[PDB]
Amino acid sequence: NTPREVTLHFLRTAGHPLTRWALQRQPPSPKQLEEEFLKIPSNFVSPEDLDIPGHASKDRYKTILPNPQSRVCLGRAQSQEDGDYINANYIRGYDGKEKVYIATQGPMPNTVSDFWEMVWQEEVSLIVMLTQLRECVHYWPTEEETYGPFQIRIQDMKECPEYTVRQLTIQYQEERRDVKHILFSAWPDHQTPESAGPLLRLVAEVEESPETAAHPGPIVVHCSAGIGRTGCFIATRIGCQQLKARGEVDILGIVCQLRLDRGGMIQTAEQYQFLHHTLALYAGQLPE
Known part of the structure; x- marks a missing residue:
């Protein structure tokens, strides 16, 4: 058994159920x-595992690459751009449900149009942006801007204690769609939020969030x-979702499944411990 078979086997079978x-x-x-x-x-995928020429100019970090098996490919239905590349992966949700999320990096200036193309192509209606104050481009408009073939407008902006909700529209030709955008700041890279409450x-x-589609698109989560x-x-x-539905959670199993979907999800042991803390707090909100 190679290192990859060893890795895959651990990720597919590790678990630690916690009532x-x-x-x-x-x-x-x-x-x-x-x-x-x-x-x-x-x-993590090695650069030798991707054969996508020019992809490096569209990566924020050279070692953080989208696993080819779950990579989001841009079909260019709406544009004339070369190739299909965005650093983004489909992520499975509760119970292995496919394409619940897309995990991606925050767009770079040269990948803003790619990002909006992805949002159109995948029928994304919700974006979750995770950031801290001192940091990450402002890829949405103040009033209205066009990105590639897409016209984006801001219909509303509401500040909550812990995040800002923007209501946007994206339009291509005759068709205009709603996108809800949530910007959660106060979350430094390689660290945890200040406490679990704002995260919950x-x-x-x-x-x-309103879910009016027949086949809901993935939720975009980025940082x-x-x-x-x-992660x-x-x-x-x-x-x-597990705690509510089953009264138990397998956090090890969860992180293992996320790493199958995109290498490296959840960076530090402190973050991993904080996940336990957060879920312990959520558990007490649950009905008897």
């Missing part, structure tokens, strides 16, 4: 969580590299 009680009252120790986290393979309110904000904060946010939502 609601154990999570709240007897969680794994900080030492055990550190060692568990260290054992999770990254599933972000997760609730997402749940409450600088598209893996640490994105934490997606893992928290799936964790909450």
